[PDB]
Amino acid sequence: HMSLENVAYNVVNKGHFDGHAGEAPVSIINNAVYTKVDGIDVEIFENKTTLPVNVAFELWAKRNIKPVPEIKILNNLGVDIAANTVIWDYKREAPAHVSTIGVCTMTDIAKKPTESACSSLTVLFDGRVEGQVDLFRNARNGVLITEGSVKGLTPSKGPAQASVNGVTLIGESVKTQFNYFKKVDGIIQQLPETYFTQSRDLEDFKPRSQMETDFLELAMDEFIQRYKLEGYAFEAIVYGDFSHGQLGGLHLMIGLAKRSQDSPLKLEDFIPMDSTVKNYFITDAQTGSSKCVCSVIDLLLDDFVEIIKSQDLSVISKVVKVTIDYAEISFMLWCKDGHVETFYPK
Amino acid sequence: MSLENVAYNVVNKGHFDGHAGEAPVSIINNAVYTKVDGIDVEIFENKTTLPVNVAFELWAKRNIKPVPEIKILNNLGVDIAANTVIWDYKREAPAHVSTIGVCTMTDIAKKPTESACSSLTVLFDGRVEGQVDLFRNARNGVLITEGSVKGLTPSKGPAQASVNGVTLIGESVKTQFNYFKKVDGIIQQLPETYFTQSRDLEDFKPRSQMETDFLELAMDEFIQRYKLEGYAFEAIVYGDFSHGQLGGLHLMIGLAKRSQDSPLKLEDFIPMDSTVKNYFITDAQTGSSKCVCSVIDLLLDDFVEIIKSQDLSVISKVVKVTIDYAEISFMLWCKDGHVETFYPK
Amino acid sequence: MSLENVAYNVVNKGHFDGHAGEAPVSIINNAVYTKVDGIDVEIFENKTTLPVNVAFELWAKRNIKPVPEIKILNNLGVDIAANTVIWDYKREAPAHVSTIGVCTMTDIAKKPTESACSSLTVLFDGRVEGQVDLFRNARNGVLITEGSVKGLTPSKGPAQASVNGVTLIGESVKTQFNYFKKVDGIIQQLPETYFTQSRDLEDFKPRSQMETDFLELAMDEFIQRYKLEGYAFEAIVYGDFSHGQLGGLHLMIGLAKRSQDSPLKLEDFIPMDSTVKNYFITDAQTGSSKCVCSVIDLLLDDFVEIIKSQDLSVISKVVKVTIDYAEISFMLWCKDGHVETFYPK
Amino acid sequence: HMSLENVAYNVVNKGHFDGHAGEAPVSIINNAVYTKVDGIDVEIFENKTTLPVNVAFELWAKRNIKPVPEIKILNNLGVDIAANTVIWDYKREAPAHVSTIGVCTMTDIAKKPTESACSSLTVLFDGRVEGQVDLFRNARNGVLITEGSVKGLTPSKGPAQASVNGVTLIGESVKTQFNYFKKVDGIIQQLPETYFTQSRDLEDFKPRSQMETDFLELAMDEFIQRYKLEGYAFEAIVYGDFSHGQLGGLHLMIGLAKRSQDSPLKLEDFIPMDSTVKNYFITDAQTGSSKCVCSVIDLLLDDFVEIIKSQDLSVISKVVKVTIDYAEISFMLWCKDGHVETFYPK
Amino acid sequence: HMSLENVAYNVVNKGHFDGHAGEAPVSIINNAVYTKVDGIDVEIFENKTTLPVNVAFELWAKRNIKPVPEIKILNNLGVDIAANTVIWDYKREAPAHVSTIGVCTMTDIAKKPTESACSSLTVLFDGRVEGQVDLFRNARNGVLITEGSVKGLTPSKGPAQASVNGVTLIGESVKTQFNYFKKVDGIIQQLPETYFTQSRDLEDFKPRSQMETDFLELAMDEFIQRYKLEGYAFEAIVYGDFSHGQLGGLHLMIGLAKRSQDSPLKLEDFIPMDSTVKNYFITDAQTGSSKCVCSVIDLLLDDFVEIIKSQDLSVISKVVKVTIDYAEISFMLWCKDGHVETFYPK
């Protein structure tokens, strides 16, 4: 049934593991996989994981190719493992999770998600596959994602985007927005009210609201004026300060895309794992201004305006907690009289 | 003649020149380094299955003249090359397992006249002394030439060739070769062929009025302008993104039309060059995707000619089109005298 | 003093900073991995020839301030840097073999004063506490500062420096440095220099009216406007793509002009940065190619000045030009009072 | 049917490849094959070859485990490829041949030794397997080994030793001495009359004739006397001279075994490959005497006597041909006025 | 001229590097060198060093095949680099020195030892090679070794043993006892008078004097009395106490050799390179006694008795400098009322 040659067969004739019978000849060398075609080798996989080459290969081939949650959502929810699939982290070119359930005999800690060894683990269940709802229903720890309503349970509307083959997108011919359900120590949990990150890169950044379009096109103070934002210090928080040797402002992703129109930015991703709050070691080409550990987060400007506009400016320093991507993010908020002085992560 | 010699040539003449000389060389991490100003600068990353030092040799001796695209040699049964290395720039490896009089570690022979060559189809380049003649004396081979060969009928090959991993139509250098094949001592007579345009999606440009009309105009305008109704272009060429699994996108230009507006991810799951390519495509705008999309880059005009010259009486048949010197099988489905679907087998 | 301490600094502060703490590490595949929520995430890929753990320490101990481009340091004969690492992002490796007070595994000393350093041209930085005084007390060394130095004549350096692998003319930060040198105890009078412009072919931009005009205007309309006939710009700068052999393109801007019409393939066969670069260039448009093209960036104005201030009576000479603090030898050919050709070495 | 996991299943259960269906879980790492046993990895193969680790594993497991000719004897007959089996070189820890016939998808040049790609190669045929003798007749280039007689064909008695699982021995419970038959370009060959290397190791050298028993026990001049050999230079050819900075003679293996009885010798086997004539960088521990490249060959002492005794002694130096292990071995024989001064391989 | 393919050619034909013209086909893979002999690859080198595989190869082949000083003697004398040769450390299968002179372009710091680069380094010179005696005279720092006597310089008789191709021995057919001369900063040095370590293995230990034979033969106090040694507690210093879980005594190699006649001793050479004083994690297989870091030093007993008997045993605990192998080794001497309590280094 299950073999390296069989996995390779699927990879070359079907583009991923499908479960078709067959064998393809394989060379393992240089932490990579090659197959013979017309007497010559053509590389079909490159191991970027800390797993043995043939194991990582089996898991990669067994990718979940349907729309799946972005790993940051899964991380923020406490997901430790997935039930009978592999959630592939495309930007680390690695599996999202340590172990496995019913996928690969080398990494499996169970063949079925409700075995004793999964008892203590928060297991991802997919409602789209037959009978995983009822598996979740009597599982100690887990997360359930569904497309439709679930009888007896209150849903938390997840984010609009999902990951489809490493492409993170809003579905149109396919459903990307899931309902989330969580279970901890045997009991149903109510997920918090959250904002959701927008999940845009700096290269392909597109605006997603009238306010965002206005943010890119208009000058600093003519924008601050239009949306009545004076006293919320967009210049020190959102915009970015490039006048000094040390870098300032530039906390939001959209504020970065603004400079990107004039000047290129280098972002060293020193810890290259996807998270709600990304820290970059940023260098500005135009000025020379640089900052290691510059925290950056992609919220809709509207969401951000709504965050900061609902804030009591009557004290020196508050600890402000905002729930984003299912995680509780801590901000320091410094206010003077009725002016916001600064706003930033901990 | 040696590692340190190959290195010297590489750093001082950009490749192997047959120059005498030697540079100190450091082998580590499946790579070649040479010392300049007392520090190591990498000059070769080995991405082959051959031992590091051997790959370096064969890479350096990579033929730097216009040579045929590797897919053409493959379709033609070319098993080996005479006294040169045809380097595969898409895999970063030699096109062939063994060599002839190139490197001791891979040579099966020193000359294509030797016995161990007799059963192999050797590529002969008429641009070098006596190789035209060697071809006449070989049992199995493919000859490429720029001009006429006396007493032999030529097959006009594709306009493109590869110069240093860049595939182009030569203006200042000749890229369109003549082709001759021999099997078991008999001159075989090569088929009438179409040639694939070998274009990338990321730099795709139209090469006729029809292709230009295809990229600019709405689906219906184009279909009507070229009276193509019933030939199922909406289901074969254009690409349907309305469902979970995506349809169409059988030609390269159909993909290029999408890319204009929104991007496609193309997983090249078996990454070697071929007439027909299969990509695991995801459509970014939509979420529609398909494992194994066969994509062939044919001039739209050539495809139009192909499909229009077909009998739509039968419910479905096998259609053989000679493309890039290979014989490709298509499945042609029909209902009531119009094309339903059309795809490689 | 721990792989884990270096690691902690990298994940938490972006690089080595001096903060106490320890992050868990896995070493595999010539790379450093760290654990975040039970899964391994790669924080370093070793592309150097040094042990993976050593290279990691040195990479983390990068100099993050604006520092000179390594070509300048090489041209100056700098063997080592005082209490810092000059990272080479082009090769992703340290610019120098060993270190001073940086890493215990490669240190040849803790301070740039002691015996081992005596015979090595040490790089000193005037921006760090009393390193100017360490320069005064050294046999061999090069000093960079921002302002004036007591009793020392400055050499005005290039406008650009490198900040975190990005070459720049700093607006919020000083990139132009003052250069001082010392050979076997004696302060040197550094020669007058042209400086190389450091532009890439991808993002090339003009920096003078003359350069703008060169990119915009037709060949002889530029030469006529700039009183340049008989200076052989047609042969030297512009680029000839009409033969199998490729001619011209001795300046970066020449390649920039062609790239406006069609792309060029550049094999950087020896991939270290330097005043004069040599590329294996293929012209996509025509098929023209040349394996060893000596090239790189001088202001077109700088080059015009150089070629014009030359006596053009002798049939051929060797000409010395001090670029990037280094004497570059050129061959200058002349027939009947007009320039024929002009090229490096 | 075939796979990496299948091969491991065979190896862990049956000790080598058997054709048993089934799969064992595997980690390829560090050019080595690991299998999971009770939670922990146990290394079951270590790639010492230039082939991909997984291809080498497959080839190894498919060892011919019955008595097979030693590799040197096969190389002297110019055997390029074995027919539907794998001869394992235990001194190299590598397959004896480059390619394969009907053994492995990665290395096969053909499936049957009856195909076109085989005509020009000398193929090892084994009478111990059905239809192979018959196959030999038709195939143009080949060497056939048998246990008994072949109707209509002249046998050639091969050496008494053969290899069983990398243990070279003379069979008592199993037959090891084969008749050899060779064939070139269509025509059935006539094999030269041969001596055979006795192929004994240094640490456990055992005498195989009364002459050898006496050689070891009796002193130098006592042996030469008892066996009538004065003027055949046994003192400077066989026994070995350790009086000079450079070691002399020791042409015969038993010569080293003799000197070993007293004090030890370091042997840098600088080319670790089986062959009729072995070359060593010997260093004598007792004296300091040493020599780069000493041609050391293990002949039955009786055989060497016969070789030198049938030798003419007229000229001052002749080049002599001696057929050992089916290979014509050249020797330089120096005669002076009546005595062999020295006699060594070219 | 010089190349990898040339070095290879030398190894497969001359046993080491000789300077012969020719080339051999080579494969570099898995930190090893292979050569093609009749269609197949035979490994001829395996890299155990921290240098690029090809570089370690250039150096290993250019081994000193002559009798050479043992590494400890050089390490104790401060030799940093040999002139125009590699001193191979066979224990580490690595070279003994960081750099090289006129040996290999990739590791040379000078083509001749007279260059500026060499002047701050103690350069090993061999009196057996043309003019290196003269080069020593004009050198700032260095160590000379000669067979015979040198004009106008006071010699120092070295150890009777030297290393011949890794094999440490007393030369009988070739000289291993060297004369030692040393310069520091232009000035000649009169070297300290010294005992030499006997450099013997436990695996094949032999006695070297009547006193040592009596040690290995006679029981404890019978021997102690016989040599008027009573009052020094060899019980705690030499013989080794095994009655405790923590291993007692056993500070001499011959002492180790005694216990080795009755029961095996496991030795972990956890810092495996050769030196005058060697530390081991020792485990006695009979009792179960164990001790990490027991300084084992192989002095001849006649030497050790001389060291201890020429000692004033008044002060309770003392520091003693003994010169062994041209190095000054510090010792701690303990004494209770005129008799010896304990004696070890540090």
PDB file of C-alpha atoms in Angstrom, chain D residues 4-176:
ATOM      1  CA  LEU D   4      11.940   1.299  -0.221  1.00  0.00           C
ATOM      2  CA  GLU D   5       9.508   0.345   2.550  1.00  0.00           C
ATOM      3  CA  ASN D   6       9.048  -3.125   1.049  1.00  0.00           C
ATOM      4  CA  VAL D   7      12.809  -3.677   1.051  1.00  0.00           C
ATOM      5  CA  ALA D   8      13.108  -2.584   4.693  1.00  0.00           C
ATOM      6  CA  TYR D   9      10.270  -4.977   5.622  1.00  0.00           C
ATOM      7  CA  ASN D  10      12.234  -7.847   4.090  1.00  0.00           C
ATOM      8  CA  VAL D  11      15.507  -6.774   5.734  1.00  0.00           C
ATOM      9  CA  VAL D  12      14.133  -6.366   9.287  1.00  0.00           C
ATOM     10  CA  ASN D  13      12.098  -9.599   9.182  1.00  0.00           C
ATOM     11  CA  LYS D  14      13.957 -11.975   6.871  1.00  0.00           C
ATOM     12  CA  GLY D  15      17.527 -10.564   7.111  1.00  0.00           C
ATOM     13  CA  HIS D  16      17.762  -9.711   3.393  1.00  0.00           C
ATOM     14  CA  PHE D  17      15.398  -9.271   0.433  1.00  0.00           C
ATOM     15  CA  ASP D  18      13.149 -12.320  -0.058  1.00  0.00           C
ATOM     16  CA  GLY D  19      10.184 -11.179  -2.162  1.00  0.00           C
ATOM     17  CA  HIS D  20       7.860 -11.066   0.849  1.00  0.00           C
ATOM     18  CA  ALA D  21       5.075  -8.500   0.518  1.00  0.00           C
ATOM     19  CA  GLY D  22       4.855  -5.852   3.233  1.00  0.00           C
ATOM     20  CA  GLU D  23       6.117  -2.467   4.363  1.00  0.00           C
ATOM     21  CA  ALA D  24       8.392  -1.259   7.158  1.00  0.00           C
ATOM     22  CA  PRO D  25       8.539   2.454   8.140  1.00  0.00           C
ATOM     23  CA  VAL D  26      11.821   4.202   7.287  1.00  0.00           C
ATOM     24  CA  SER D  27      13.863   7.357   7.903  1.00  0.00           C
ATOM     25  CA  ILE D  28      16.521   8.186   5.344  1.00  0.00           C
ATOM     26  CA  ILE D  29      19.084  10.486   6.980  1.00  0.00           C
ATOM     27  CA  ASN D  30      22.905  10.940   6.859  1.00  0.00           C
ATOM     28  CA  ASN D  31      23.327   8.596   3.867  1.00  0.00           C
ATOM     29  CA  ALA D  32      21.817   5.889   6.110  1.00  0.00           C
ATOM     30  CA  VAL D  33      18.573   3.923   6.474  1.00  0.00           C
ATOM     31  CA  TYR D  34      16.808   3.844   9.827  1.00  0.00           C
ATOM     32  CA  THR D  35      13.773   1.853  10.864  1.00  0.00           C
ATOM     33  CA  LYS D  36      11.421   2.476  13.783  1.00  0.00           C
ATOM     34  CA  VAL D  37      11.449  -0.233  16.462  1.00  0.00           C
ATOM     35  CA  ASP D  38       9.503   0.291  19.713  1.00  0.00           C
ATOM     36  CA  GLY D  39       9.399   4.082  19.324  1.00  0.00           C
ATOM     37  CA  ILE D  40      13.128   4.518  18.575  1.00  0.00           C
ATOM     38  CA  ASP D  41      15.123   4.547  15.315  1.00  0.00           C
ATOM     39  CA  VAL D  42      17.526   1.678  14.637  1.00  0.00           C
ATOM     40  CA  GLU D  43      20.053   2.065  11.797  1.00  0.00           C
ATOM     41  CA  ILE D  44      19.805  -0.865   9.378  1.00  0.00           C
ATOM     42  CA  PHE D  45      21.954   0.363   6.455  1.00  0.00           C
ATOM     43  CA  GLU D  46      24.876   2.735   5.895  1.00  0.00           C
ATOM     44  CA  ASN D  47      25.559   3.864   2.312  1.00  0.00           C
ATOM     45  CA  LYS D  48      29.232   3.378   1.503  1.00  0.00           C
ATOM     46  CA  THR D  49      28.626   3.623  -2.249  1.00  0.00           C
ATOM     47  CA  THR D  50      28.499   6.476  -4.783  1.00  0.00           C
ATOM     48  CA  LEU D  51      24.864   5.603  -5.561  1.00  0.00           C
ATOM     49  CA  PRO D  52      21.825   7.279  -3.955  1.00  0.00           C
ATOM     50  CA  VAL D  53      21.406   5.815  -0.448  1.00  0.00           C
ATOM     51  CA  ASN D  54      17.978   4.323  -1.264  1.00  0.00           C
ATOM     52  CA  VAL D  55      19.210   2.728  -4.507  1.00  0.00           C
ATOM     53  CA  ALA D  56      22.202   1.255  -2.654  1.00  0.00           C
ATOM     54  CA  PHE D  57      19.893  -0.090   0.069  1.00  0.00           C
ATOM     55  CA  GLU D  58      17.747  -1.853  -2.557  1.00  0.00           C
ATOM     56  CA  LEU D  59      20.851  -3.247  -4.309  1.00  0.00           C
ATOM     57  CA  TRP D  60      22.404  -4.390  -1.023  1.00  0.00           C
ATOM     58  CA  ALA D  61      19.302  -6.242   0.234  1.00  0.00           C
ATOM     59  CA  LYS D  62      19.141  -8.063  -3.109  1.00  0.00           C
ATOM     60  CA  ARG D  63      22.573  -9.607  -2.470  1.00  0.00           C
ATOM     61  CA  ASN D  64      23.161 -12.962  -4.021  1.00  0.00           C
ATOM     62  CA  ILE D  65      23.564 -14.854  -0.734  1.00  0.00           C
ATOM     63  CA  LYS D  66      24.595 -18.198  -2.246  1.00  0.00           C
ATOM     64  CA  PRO D  67      28.275 -18.956  -2.961  1.00  0.00           C
ATOM     65  CA  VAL D  68      29.383 -16.580  -5.701  1.00  0.00           C
ATOM     66  CA  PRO D  69      32.753 -16.085  -7.418  1.00  0.00           C
ATOM     67  CA  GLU D  70      35.089 -13.579  -5.793  1.00  0.00           C
ATOM     68  CA  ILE D  71      35.118 -10.202  -7.547  1.00  0.00           C
ATOM     69  CA  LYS D  72      38.777 -10.396  -8.670  1.00  0.00           C
ATOM     70  CA  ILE D  73      38.056 -13.592 -10.612  1.00  0.00           C
ATOM     71  CA  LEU D  74      35.094 -11.881 -12.294  1.00  0.00           C
ATOM     72  CA  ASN D  75      37.111  -8.754 -13.133  1.00  0.00           C
ATOM     73  CA  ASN D  76      39.917 -10.814 -14.705  1.00  0.00           C
ATOM     74  CA  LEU D  77      37.300 -12.373 -16.997  1.00  0.00           C
ATOM     75  CA  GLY D  78      35.894  -8.908 -17.796  1.00  0.00           C
ATOM     76  CA  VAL D  79      32.378  -9.450 -16.449  1.00  0.00           C
ATOM     77  CA  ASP D  80      30.612  -6.100 -16.875  1.00  0.00           C
ATOM     78  CA  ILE D  81      27.191  -7.035 -15.484  1.00  0.00           C
ATOM     79  CA  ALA D  82      25.449  -9.885 -13.631  1.00  0.00           C
ATOM     80  CA  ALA D  83      22.300 -11.540 -15.006  1.00  0.00           C
ATOM     81  CA  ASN D  84      19.242 -11.018 -12.782  1.00  0.00           C
ATOM     82  CA  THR D  85      21.142 -10.827  -9.501  1.00  0.00           C
ATOM     83  CA  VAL D  86      23.497  -8.551  -7.574  1.00  0.00           C
ATOM     84  CA  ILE D  87      27.052  -9.491  -6.650  1.00  0.00           C
ATOM     85  CA  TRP D  88      27.987  -7.461  -3.561  1.00  0.00           C
ATOM     86  CA  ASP D  89      31.574  -6.269  -3.157  1.00  0.00           C
ATOM     87  CA  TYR D  90      32.098  -6.700   0.591  1.00  0.00           C
ATOM     88  CA  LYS D  91      35.579  -5.099   0.634  1.00  0.00           C
ATOM     89  CA  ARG D  92      34.199  -1.902  -0.934  1.00  0.00           C
ATOM     90  CA  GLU D  93      30.744  -2.387   0.625  1.00  0.00           C
ATOM     91  CA  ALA D  94      29.292  -1.603  -2.807  1.00  0.00           C
ATOM     92  CA  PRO D  95      27.661  -3.380  -5.749  1.00  0.00           C
ATOM     93  CA  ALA D  96      30.248  -5.175  -7.905  1.00  0.00           C
ATOM     94  CA  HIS D  97      28.815  -3.623 -11.068  1.00  0.00           C
ATOM     95  CA  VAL D  98      27.640  -0.270 -12.439  1.00  0.00           C
ATOM     96  CA  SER D  99      24.343  -1.448 -13.879  1.00  0.00           C
ATOM     97  CA  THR D 100      21.857  -4.268 -13.402  1.00  0.00           C
ATOM     98  CA  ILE D 101      19.585  -6.624 -15.346  1.00  0.00           C
ATOM     99  CA  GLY D 102      16.075  -7.212 -13.968  1.00  0.00           C
ATOM    100  CA  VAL D 103      16.961  -6.361 -10.369  1.00  0.00           C
ATOM    101  CA  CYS D 104      16.140  -2.694  -9.723  1.00  0.00           C
ATOM    102  CA  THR D 105      14.269   0.041 -11.636  1.00  0.00           C
ATOM    103  CA  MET D 106      16.952   2.666 -10.870  1.00  0.00           C
ATOM    104  CA  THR D 107      19.924   0.686 -12.238  1.00  0.00           C
ATOM    105  CA  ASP D 108      18.569  -1.764 -14.845  1.00  0.00           C
ATOM    106  CA  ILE D 109      19.818  -1.456 -18.418  1.00  0.00           C
ATOM    107  CA  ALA D 110      17.415  -4.293 -19.254  1.00  0.00           C
ATOM    108  CA  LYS D 111      14.944  -6.668 -17.597  1.00  0.00           C
ATOM    109  CA  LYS D 112      16.131  -9.901 -19.226  1.00  0.00           C
ATOM    110  CA  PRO D 113      19.738 -10.643 -20.269  1.00  0.00           C
ATOM    111  CA  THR D 114      18.099 -11.289 -23.645  1.00  0.00           C
ATOM    112  CA  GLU D 115      17.603  -7.637 -24.703  1.00  0.00           C
ATOM    113  CA  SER D 116      19.582  -5.400 -27.112  1.00  0.00           C
ATOM    114  CA  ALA D 117      21.363  -3.254 -24.490  1.00  0.00           C
ATOM    115  CA  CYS D 118      23.149  -6.407 -23.253  1.00  0.00           C
ATOM    116  CA  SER D 119      24.731  -7.832 -26.449  1.00  0.00           C
ATOM    117  CA  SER D 120      27.968  -5.861 -26.037  1.00  0.00           C
ATOM    118  CA  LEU D 121      28.311  -6.657 -22.319  1.00  0.00           C
ATOM    119  CA  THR D 122      29.826  -9.768 -20.735  1.00  0.00           C
ATOM    120  CA  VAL D 123      27.044 -11.135 -18.559  1.00  0.00           C
ATOM    121  CA  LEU D 124      27.474 -13.521 -15.634  1.00  0.00           C
ATOM    122  CA  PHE D 125      25.248 -16.573 -16.026  1.00  0.00           C
ATOM    123  CA  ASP D 126      24.616 -19.069 -13.233  1.00  0.00           C
ATOM    124  CA  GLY D 127      23.710 -22.706 -13.932  1.00  0.00           C
ATOM    125  CA  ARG D 128      22.275 -22.926 -10.413  1.00  0.00           C
ATOM    126  CA  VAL D 129      19.326 -20.932 -11.735  1.00  0.00           C
ATOM    127  CA  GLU D 130      16.756 -22.256 -14.229  1.00  0.00           C
ATOM    128  CA  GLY D 131      17.246 -21.548 -17.935  1.00  0.00           C
ATOM    129  CA  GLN D 132      20.449 -19.515 -17.523  1.00  0.00           C
ATOM    130  CA  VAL D 133      22.793 -22.078 -19.098  1.00  0.00           C
ATOM    131  CA  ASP D 134      20.428 -22.066 -22.079  1.00  0.00           C
ATOM    132  CA  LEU D 135      20.355 -18.247 -22.050  1.00  0.00           C
ATOM    133  CA  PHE D 136      24.175 -18.216 -22.061  1.00  0.00           C
ATOM    134  CA  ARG D 137      24.353 -20.238 -25.295  1.00  0.00           C
ATOM    135  CA  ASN D 138      22.284 -17.667 -27.230  1.00  0.00           C
ATOM    136  CA  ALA D 139      23.765 -14.471 -25.721  1.00  0.00           C
ATOM    137  CA  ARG D 140      26.931 -13.390 -27.557  1.00  0.00           C
ATOM    138  CA  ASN D 141      29.184 -12.062 -24.768  1.00  0.00           C
ATOM    139  CA  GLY D 142      29.170 -13.836 -21.403  1.00  0.00           C
ATOM    140  CA  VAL D 143      30.723 -15.928 -18.640  1.00  0.00           C
ATOM    141  CA  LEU D 144      28.806 -18.967 -17.367  1.00  0.00           C
ATOM    142  CA  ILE D 145      29.438 -20.615 -14.008  1.00  0.00           C
ATOM    143  CA  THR D 146      28.042 -24.091 -13.275  1.00  0.00           C
ATOM    144  CA  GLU D 147      28.143 -26.735 -10.549  1.00  0.00           C
ATOM    145  CA  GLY D 148      28.327 -29.722 -12.915  1.00  0.00           C
ATOM    146  CA  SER D 149      29.086 -30.636 -16.533  1.00  0.00           C
ATOM    147  CA  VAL D 150      27.626 -28.922 -19.609  1.00  0.00           C
ATOM    148  CA  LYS D 151      26.661 -31.127 -22.564  1.00  0.00           C
ATOM    149  CA  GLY D 152      28.757 -30.285 -25.634  1.00  0.00           C
ATOM    150  CA  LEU D 153      31.028 -27.820 -23.808  1.00  0.00           C
ATOM    151  CA  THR D 154      34.531 -27.912 -22.324  1.00  0.00           C
ATOM    152  CA  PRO D 155      34.625 -26.896 -18.638  1.00  0.00           C
ATOM    153  CA  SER D 156      37.376 -24.891 -16.968  1.00  0.00           C
ATOM    154  CA  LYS D 157      37.871 -25.707 -13.292  1.00  0.00           C
ATOM    155  CA  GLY D 158      37.587 -22.481 -11.300  1.00  0.00           C
ATOM    156  CA  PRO D 159      39.116 -21.716  -7.903  1.00  0.00           C
ATOM    157  CA  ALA D 160      38.149 -23.799  -4.863  1.00  0.00           C
ATOM    158  CA  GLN D 161      37.026 -20.745  -2.852  1.00  0.00           C
ATOM    159  CA  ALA D 162      33.875 -18.690  -3.311  1.00  0.00           C
ATOM    160  CA  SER D 163      32.177 -15.924  -1.330  1.00  0.00           C
ATOM    161  CA  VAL D 164      29.256 -16.643   1.022  1.00  0.00           C
ATOM    162  CA  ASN D 165      27.785 -13.425   2.514  1.00  0.00           C
ATOM    163  CA  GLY D 166      31.206 -11.771   2.381  1.00  0.00           C
ATOM    164  CA  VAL D 167      32.880 -14.788   3.935  1.00  0.00           C
ATOM    165  CA  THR D 168      35.308 -16.299   1.451  1.00  0.00           C
ATOM    166  CA  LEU D 169      35.651 -20.049   2.098  1.00  0.00           C
ATOM    167  CA  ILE D 170      36.021 -23.556   0.639  1.00  0.00           C
ATOM    168  CA  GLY D 171      32.578 -25.161   0.841  1.00  0.00           C
ATOM    169  CA  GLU D 172      31.968 -28.365   2.801  1.00  0.00           C
ATOM    170  CA  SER D 173      28.185 -28.208   3.207  1.00  0.00           C
ATOM    171  CA  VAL D 174      27.778 -26.216  -0.010  1.00  0.00           C
ATOM    172  CA  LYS D 175      29.474 -26.301  -3.440  1.00  0.00           C
ATOM    173  CA  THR D 176      31.885 -23.409  -4.155  1.00  0.00           C
TER     174      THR D 176
END
